[PDB]
Amino acid sequence: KPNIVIFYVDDLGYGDLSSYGMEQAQTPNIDALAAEGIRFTDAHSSAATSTPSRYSLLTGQYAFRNNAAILPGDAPLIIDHTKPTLPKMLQKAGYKTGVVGKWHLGLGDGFVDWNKAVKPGPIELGFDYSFLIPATADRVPTVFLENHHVVNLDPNDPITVSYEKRIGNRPVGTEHPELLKMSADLQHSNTIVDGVSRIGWMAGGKSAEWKDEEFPHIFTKKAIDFISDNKDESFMLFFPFSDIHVPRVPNKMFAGKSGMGPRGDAILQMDWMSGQIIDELKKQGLYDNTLIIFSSDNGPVMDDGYADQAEELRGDHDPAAGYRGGKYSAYEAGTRVPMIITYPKGIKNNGDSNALVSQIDIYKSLAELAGVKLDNSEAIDSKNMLPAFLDAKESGRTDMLEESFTLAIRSGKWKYIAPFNGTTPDWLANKTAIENGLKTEPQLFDLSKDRNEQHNVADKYPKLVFSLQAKINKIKARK
């Protein structure tokens, strides 16, 4: 039974790898995986934002089924811990499980006292070991959580977090721009730590504050500690990167080296972080009997809140590589992300694969790998794609959901986006460089003639529109 490692990059776009087209900088370590293994060209995150994609990846359930949406850093755990989870399925098969990186699935069951035992958390979800950034890099609280406790927390300088009003004695970005390494939009202009303002306020916790620049070393180290401690048994590591999420404050090992600014330097950081872990697996002789899944939680974004020159220094770079949309979108670039799989022992055919695969398929696929029988209720929306994960010649799905602020479905070459008639959060206004694809009219595209989704042919094909819409409706009605 192989080891499992899931490299999970924050906001990595389809074209954000040199093995997926990037010319202005290279990602040699990740590029090496694609050369050896299977490079997926029609693989998808379950959603176009973070919290819902992670929810599906770990539960095998569509995010809308529990209304999963981008969370604050003090939100309660959105996964019901009394139910099967992907890591839980693996412990069953005898795996040691661990997660090192950004969480963003919630913590606790109502009110998080950051100075006491924090639970339910990952450990209650079937992870033997955890070391987390609570939410995202740009949200408070601004600390690491190891298993059930905040790291380097001092009793006499206790932590409190607010998303309602300003608390504590830390400067805030709006009032002290001279303390800011980069300027930030109003949503991101609250409590300053390590010269960067964040979303929300945090009081206390000086001993426990993180230093963004120190991430690549902190997180690779904990990972390697986990691989070391558990090398004598079957282990699974979930490594959700904070990179390349804002704020991009890359390490000086990378800063200014991509020629694309902090966004590009962050891609570089990710690729070096990946390499440290892969190479350790190589040195310790674990690599050949390890299945590595490398992917992303959603599509790319340039300016996501900070004045980090992403647009000014982008040049010719296209982080979606010719697909319409990006982060937050129902268009292909919202969910169509790099996925690369390596497993020397088990891959029958290396090469590029265009199997229609969604990250929600990982659940049942690993189950088959681990030899675990699933309940009829466990991972209901998941499908076994293990053949297509190990053979670039196998096909994957017939049809596939993509979740955004609306819902969209792929059925072969067809791309349908259901009409949206709700309201969207105020911060979405900031992201208009990206076409979100939310219209009150139906949209239908043939990606085989129209890869970029520029020609809506729903008036040409009402037969098809009605069909695919009922499919989305029927999916929502699955009981």
* C-beta closer to a second copy: residue 259 or 425: 259
Q: Is 142 in the site for ligand G6S (CB under 6 A)?
A: no
Q: Is 19 in the site for ligand G6S (CB under 6 A)?
A: no
Q: Is 11 in the site for Ca ion (CB under 5 A)?
A: yes
Token reading at 359: 């990250």
296: left (phi over 0), alpha (psi -120 to 50) or beta: beta
* C-beta closer to a second copy: residue 77 or 268: 268
* C-beta closer to a second copy: residue 287 or 405: 287
Number of residues that bind Ca ion (CB under 5 A): 5
> Rounded to the nearest whole angstrom, what is the least distance from the CB of residue 36 to a second copy in the complex?
4
Q: Is 16 in the site for Ca ion (CB under 5 A)?
A: no
Q: Which does 246 bind (CB under 5 to 8 A by kind): Ca ion, ligand G6S, a second copy, none?
A: ligand G6S
Contact 455, 447 (CB under 8 A): no
> Rounded to the nearest whole angstrom, what is the least distance from the CB of residue 332 to ligand G6S in the complex?
17
Q: Which residues in this chain contact a second copy in the complex, by CB under 8 A? A: 26, 28-29, 31-32, 35-36, 253, 257, 259, 271-272, 275, 278-280, 282-283, 285, 287, 350-351
Residues within window 393-452 making contact with ligand G6S, judged by CB under 6 A: 427, 430
How many Å apart are CA 448 and CA 280, to the nearest integer?
Answer: 41
* C-beta closer to a second copy: residue 28 or 177: 28
* C-beta closer to a second copy: residue 105 or 224: 224
- The region of 298-306, 390-398, 455-463, 470-478 touching ligand G6S under the rule CB under 6 A is 298-306
* C-beta closer to Ca ion: residue 10 or 402: 10
> Rounded to the nearest whole angstrom, what is the least distance from the CB of residue 257 to a second copy in the complex?
6
How many Å apart are CA 356 and CA 399, to the nearest integer?
Answer: 8
Q: Which of 31, 42, 74, 138 binds ligand G6S (CB under 6 A)?
A: 138
Residue 270 is which amino acid?
A: M
- Which residues have CB under 8 Å from 18's CB, separation 6+? 25, 26, 27, 28, 31
- Full DSSP string of 127-164: -SEEEEESS-TTBS--S-EETTEETT--TTS--EEESS
Contact 59, 85 (CB under 8 A): yes
* C-beta closer to a second copy: residue 29 or 295: 29
How many Å apart are CA 380 and CA 441, to the nearest integer?
Answer: 30
Token reading at 121: 């958390």
Token reading at 411: 């059925």
Contact 264, 271 (CB under 8 A): no
Q: Which does 187 bind (CB under 5 to 8 A by kind): a second copy, ligand G6S, Ca ion, none?
A: ligand G6S
> Rounded to the nearest whole angstrom, what is the least distance from the CB of residue 280 to a second copy in the complex?
8
Sign of CA pseudo-dihedral 24, 30, 32, 34: negative
Q: Which does 104 bind (CB under 5 to 8 A by kind): ligand G6S, Ca ion, a second copy, none?
A: ligand G6S
Residue 196 in 3-state DSSP? strand
> Using the 8-state DSSP alphabet, how is residue 348 labeled?
S
DSSP strand pairing (145-146 vs 149-150): antiparallel
Beta strand ranges found along 316-359 (DSSP E): 339-342, 351-353, 357-358
> Rounded to the nearest whole angstrom, what is the least distance from the CB of residue 219 to a second copy in the complex?
17
Residue 200 in 3-state DSSP? coil
Residues within window 220-259 making contact with Ca ion, judged by CB under 5 A: none
Q: Is 246 in the site for ligand G6S (CB under 6 A)?
A: yes
Contact 250, 273 (CB under 8 A): no
> Rounded to the nearest whole angstrom, what is the least distance from the CB of residue 344 to a second copy in the complex?
8
- The region of 11-19, 24-32, 348-356, 393-401 touching Ca ion under the rule CB under 5 A is 11-19
Nearest Cα neighbor of 46 from 429, 410, 386 is: 410
* C-beta closer to ligand G6S: residue 189 or 353: 189
Q: Is 163 in the site for ligand G6S (CB under 6 A)?
A: no
Q: Which of 74, 297, 304, 332 binds Ca ion (CB under 5 A)?
A: 297
Q: Which does 427 bind (CB under 5 to 8 A by kind): a second copy, ligand G6S, Ca ion, none?
A: ligand G6S
* C-beta closer to ligand G6S: residue 128 or 403: 403
Nearest Cα neighbor of 198 from 246, 145, 157 is: 246
Q: Is 128 in the site for Ca ion (CB under 5 A)?
A: no
Q: Which residues does residue 40 pair with via DSSP β-bridges, in sequence order? A: 339, 353
Contact 396, 355 (CB under 8 A): yes
Sign of CA pseudo-dihedral 280, 283, 285, 291: positive
* C-beta closer to ligand G6S: residue 213 or 304: 304
* C-beta closer to ligand G6S: residue 427 or 461: 427
Distances (CA, A) of 189 to 138, 177, 197, 206, 396: 10, 9, 5, 19, 44
- List residues binding ligand G6S (CB under 6 A): 10-11, 49-50, 70, 104, 136, 138, 187, 245-246, 298, 304-305, 427, 430
